[PDB]
Design an enzyme around this catalytic site. Structure first.
Site, short mmCIF file in Angstrom:
data_model
loop_
_atom_site.label_atom_id
_atom_site.label_comp_id
_atom_site.label_asym_id
_atom_site.label_seq_id
_atom_site.Cartn_x
_atom_site.Cartn_y
_atom_site.Cartn_z
N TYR A 60 0.82 -1.20 0.00
CA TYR A 60 0.00 0.00 0.00
C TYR A 60 0.87 1.26 0.00
O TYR A 60 1.74 1.42 0.85
CB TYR A 60 -0.90 -0.04 1.24
CG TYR A 60 -2.05 0.94 1.30
CD1 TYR A 60 -3.18 0.78 0.49
CD2 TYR A 60 -2.02 1.98 2.22
CE1 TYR A 60 -4.26 1.67 0.60
CE2 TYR A 60 -3.07 2.88 2.32
CZ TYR A 60 -4.18 2.73 1.51
OH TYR A 60 -5.21 3.64 1.65
N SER A 133 3.88 -7.05 2.11
CA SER A 133 2.75 -6.48 2.89
C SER A 133 1.44 -6.78 2.18
O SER A 133 1.13 -7.98 2.01
CB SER A 133 3.03 -5.00 3.16
OG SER A 133 2.10 -4.48 4.11
N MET A 134 0.64 -5.80 1.76
CA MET A 134 -0.54 -6.10 0.97
C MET A 134 -0.20 -6.88 -0.30
O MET A 134 -1.01 -7.69 -0.78
CB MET A 134 -1.27 -4.81 0.61
CG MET A 134 -2.39 -4.43 1.57
SD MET A 134 -3.35 -3.05 0.91
CE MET A 134 -4.26 -2.52 2.37
N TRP A 158 0.19 -9.18 4.70
CA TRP A 158 -1.05 -8.76 5.36
C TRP A 158 -2.26 -9.03 4.46
O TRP A 158 -2.22 -8.81 3.25
CB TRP A 158 -1.00 -7.27 5.73
CG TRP A 158 -2.20 -6.89 6.54
CD1 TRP A 158 -2.32 -6.93 7.90
CD2 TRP A 158 -3.47 -6.46 6.04
NE1 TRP A 158 -3.59 -6.54 8.28
CE2 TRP A 158 -4.31 -6.24 7.16
CE3 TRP A 158 -3.99 -6.23 4.75
CZ2 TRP A 158 -5.65 -5.81 7.03
CZ3 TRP A 158 -5.30 -5.79 4.62
CH2 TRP A 158 -6.12 -5.59 5.75
N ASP A 179 7.66 -5.45 13.54
CA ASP A 179 6.68 -4.89 12.60
C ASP A 179 5.50 -4.28 13.36
O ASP A 179 4.81 -4.97 14.12
CB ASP A 179 6.20 -5.99 11.67
CG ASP A 179 5.56 -5.45 10.39
OD1 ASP A 179 4.82 -4.44 10.45
OD2 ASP A 179 5.81 -6.05 9.31
N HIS A 210 9.06 -2.91 9.53
CA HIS A 210 8.20 -3.39 8.44
C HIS A 210 8.96 -3.53 7.12
O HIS A 210 8.64 -4.39 6.29
CB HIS A 210 7.02 -2.43 8.29
CG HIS A 210 5.99 -2.88 7.31
ND1 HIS A 210 5.45 -4.15 7.32
CD2 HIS A 210 5.37 -2.22 6.31
CE1 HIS A 210 4.54 -4.24 6.37
NE2 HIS A 210 4.48 -3.09 5.73
#
Length: 263
Positions: A60, A133-134, A158, A179, A210
Site C-alpha cells: 500500500y 505487505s498487501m 497482510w 513490525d 516493516h
C-alpha cells in the site's frame, strides 16, 4: 539421468550470499502493460536453457523501488523476474493478486514475441509469486487460487483474512520482529499456522521494522540466500539446494524459525 531444469554450477554458502550469482543480467521496461500499472523485466543473458518466471508486487502506497533489489539478485541465479507498479498505489490485496497474475500472463506472451529480449528464454509452465505487505497478501491469494504455481515467498504479509488453509504451494514467509504495521502475532504467524497441506517455512528477522526485507536492507546475505535457494529447490526441483532451502540457518539475525513438510 539428469534434472532438465538444473542450471549453473554447484552452489556454496559463499556464492549464495554474494550480491550477484553466476549469470549476467539485463533488463527492460514493459512498453504497454496489460492489466497492471508498470513493469520492469530482469533476465539472464547466458543461463544455458529456459528458466522459470517470478512476479513481485509492492504494498500500500509503495512502488517498484521498494522490492527492486530482488530483480538482479534472483535473475543472476537463473530466473526471469517482473517487478510491478499497481494501477493505483491504493489498491487492496484482491486487486493486487489480479495484477500479479496479469504480469505473469504478459511475461508468457513476451516469450513468444520475436522482438522481445526474453524471446524463448522462459519456461511458461514454471512460475512463482512474491511480494511485500498487501502485495504479500496478494501473493497468498494468487497461490490459493492457482495451485499450478510452483513457489511463493511473501514478505511481511497482510490480508483481511488469516485463513489460508487451502494453499498447497510451497510457501516461505519472511517476517520482521518489530513490525508495527502488519504485526507478526496478528498476521504473519496466524497465516503460517493456518497452512496445513504444503511445504512451508517461517523466518523472522531479528529487530526488523516493516521494511526489513526491502531494497537497501542490512540482511541481504541471508534473505537473498534463503530466497534464491527456496525458488531453486521448488521451481527447479533442484536437490542441490535441499539443505539450503530447509535448514535452520542458526544465525544471530533470525529471532524465530519454523518449518514443516520440507524434506
Amino acid at each position: 539421468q539428469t534434472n532438465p531444469y538444473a542450471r549453473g554450477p554447484n552452489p556454496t554458502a559463499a556464492s549464495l550470499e554474494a550480491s550477484a550469482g553466476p549469470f549476467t543480467v539485463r533488463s527492460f521496461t514493459v512498453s504497454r502493460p496489460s492489466g497492471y500499472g508498470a513493469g520492469t523485466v530482469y533476465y539472464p543473458t547466458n543461463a544455458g536453457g529456459t528458466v522459470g518466471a517470478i512476479a513481485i508486487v509492492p504494498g500500500y502506497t509503495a512502488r517498484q523501488s521498494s522490492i527492486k533489489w530482488w530483480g538482479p539478485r534472483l535473475a543472476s541465479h537463473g530466473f526471469v523476474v517482473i517487478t510491478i507498479d499497481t494501477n493505483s498505489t491504493l489498491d487492496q490485496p484482491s486487486s493486487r493478486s489480479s495484477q500479479q497474475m496479469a504480469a505473469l500472463r504478459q511475461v508468457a506472451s513476451l516469450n513468444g514475441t520475436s522482438s522481445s529480449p526474453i524471446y524463448g528464454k522462459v519456461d511458461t509452465a514454471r512460475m512463482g509469486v512474491m511480494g511485500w505487505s498487501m502485495g504479500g497478501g496478494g501473493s497468498l491469494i494468487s497461490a490459493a487460487n492457482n495451485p499450478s504455481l510452483k513457489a511463493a515467498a511473501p514478505q511481511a504479509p497482510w490480508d483481511s483474512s488469516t485463513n489460508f488453509s487451502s494453499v498447497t504451494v510451497p510457501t516461505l514467509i519472511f517476517a520482521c520482529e518489530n513490525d508495527s504495521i502488519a504485526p507478526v502475532n496478528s498476521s504473519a504467524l496466524p497465516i503460517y499456522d493456518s497452512m496445513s497441506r504444503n511445504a512451508k517455512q517461517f523466518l523472522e528477522i531479528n529487530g526488523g521494522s516493516h521494511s526489513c526485507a526491502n531494497s537497501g536492507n542490512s540482511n541481504q546475505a541471508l534473505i537473498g540466500k534463503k530466497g534464491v535457494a527456496w525458488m531453486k529447490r521448488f521451481m527447479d526441483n533442484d536437490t542441490r539446494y535441499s539443505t539450503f532451502a530447509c535448514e535452520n540457518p542458526n544465525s544471530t539475525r533470525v529471532s524465530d524459525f519454523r518449518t514443516a513438510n520440507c524434506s
